[PDB]
Each structure stands twice: as C-alpha cells, then as structure tokens.
Design a protein around this ligand. Structure first.
Ligand SMILES: COc1cc(OC)cc(-c2noc(N3CCN(C)C4(CCN(c5ccnc(C)c5)CC4)C3)n2)c1
Ligand SMILES: C[S@@+](CC[C@H](N)C(=O)[O-])C[C@H]1O[C@@H](n2cnc3c(N)ncnc32)[C@H](O)[C@@H]1O
Ligand SMILES: [Zn+2]
Length: 185
C-alpha cells in the first residue's frame, strides 16, 4: 500500500516531509544506543550513546537530564527508539515516562519507560519549557518514538524535547488522512 502516516520523516532544513531521503539533504542519520541486554538493572544509563552525559538538569527541580559533550550534534540527527514496556492500560499515561504510540484512528498504546531495566537512556531527557530552548522533537516513526534535532546542539548544552503534529493526539485524530503527502513540495 501507500506509506502510513508514521512512515514519513521530516527534513528540518527544507521544512517538509519525505520518504527515504530528502532530495537536497539526504537520508537522516540514526544514532545507535550502546548495546545492553534487556532486563539489565542499570540498562537505561548504560544504553547512552557515546558523546552524551546524564547529569542534573539545567531546569530547576527537574531531576536528571541528558547533555551533549563530545561535539556539535547536527540537524536531523535521530535518537531512539524510545524503549520500554508496551501497555494498553491508561494507568501508564502521566507516570512521567510514557509516550503515546498511535495504532489507528484515535487508537493508542503506551510505551512506558519508568522501569529502568526495560527502558533506554531517552527516559532521562527532560522537556523544553519553550520553543527557544527546545532542541529535540519527539515524533512517531514505524510505531515507535524517536527524538530528532531541530537545532545544532553545541557541547555543554542539555537535550530538551517536546512534540507537535507528528506525535500522539494530533497524529491519532488525523490518522489515515494522508496529510503529510500534501506537504512534500
Ligand atoms: C515521556 O515524558 C513525558 C511525556 C509527556 O507528555 C506526553 C510530558 C512530560 C513532561 N515532563 O514534565 C512535564 N511538565 C512540566 C511542566 N510543564 C512546563 C509541562 C512541560 C512542557 N509543556 C510545554 C507546552 C508547550 N510548549 C512546550 C515547549 C512545552 C508544558 C507542560 C509539563 N511534562 C514528559
Ligand atoms: C522523562 S522524565 C525526565 C527525566 C527526569 N528528570 C528524571 O530525573 O527521571 C520526566 C519527569 O521529569 C520531570 N520533568 C521533566 N521535564 C520537566 C520540566 N520541564 N519541568 C519540571 N519537571 C520536569 C517530571 O517529574 C517528569 O515526570
Ligand atoms: Zn531537506
């Protein structure tokens, strides 16, 4: 069939959707987690890619965060997938660590990263408070959540994430409507 709504990627330089590669800026770059057996008690921390550090958040009273150290993270760098336990119970939502996975017309599942032994490092990423400090966008791709860079992130800066059209409720309400197809060029 046609690509599903979550079979599209987004080119942050063109500001439009594409399928395999942007004709001007190429396929995106996916960063792989460090390998760790699922179920391992400090797996989340251990999965962290090289170049990043977990540490106290620059956002006050917000526990831990994830910070860039090695070098400049470029635009259209993709992290993930967000790992965790898969659940249809509503109890998982708003425990702090669950993302919505859209499975149909307003139909959902949760990926619950609370349990450290099942999650990955992305559970430690805090949310942006405003568009200006936001440097990651959470979105659904292949029934999974990824975070992509929407700014160049210099060494020393915290990864801060939020979402929009391509995630959760907005994605579920419009599901099947082929709306990204319209926004290619
Ligand atoms: C998988 O982790 C998740 C998933 C999630 O929602 C699906 C929310 C959170 C989450 N963690 O903390 C918070 N709150 C802190 C206080 N508070 C500031 C907010 C977070 C940021 N919000 C916005 C709104 C508009 N534009 C931007 C840039 C950000 C406002 C509510 C709520 N929310 C974490
Ligand atoms: C996915 S976690 C982020 C990692 C978390 N800081 C930790 O130490 O486990 C989400 C939780 O962190 C806290 N948090 C994340 N972003 C925040 C923000 N912008 N302001 C206040 N608290 C935040 C909230 O308690 C939320 O339930
Ligand atoms: Zn492009």
């Amino acid at each position: 069939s046609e690509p599903q709504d979550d079979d599209y990627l987004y080119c942050e330089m063109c500001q439009n959707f594409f399928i395999d590669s942007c004709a001007a800026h190429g396929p995106p770059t996916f960063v792989k987690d460090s390998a760790v057996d699922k179920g391992h008690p400090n797996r989340s921390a251990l999965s962290l890619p090289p170049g990043l550090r977990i540490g106290p958040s620059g956002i006050p009273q917000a526990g831990l965060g994830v910070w860039n150290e090695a070098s400049d993270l470029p635009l259209g760098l993709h992290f993930g997938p967000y790992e965790g336990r898969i659940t249809e119970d509503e109890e998982a939502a708003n425990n702090g660590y669950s993302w919505l996975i859209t499975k149909g017309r307003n139909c959902y599942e949760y990926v619950d990263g609370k349990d450290k032994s099942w999650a990955n490092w992305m559970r430690y990423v805090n949310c942006a408070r405003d568009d200006e400090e936001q440097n990651l966008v959470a979105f659904q791709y292949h029934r999974q959540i990824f975070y992509r860079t929407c700014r160049v992130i210099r060494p020393g800066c915290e990864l801060l994430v939020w979402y929009g059209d391509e995630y959760g409720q907005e994605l579920g309400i419009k599901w099947g409507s082929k709306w990204k197809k319209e926004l290619m060029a």
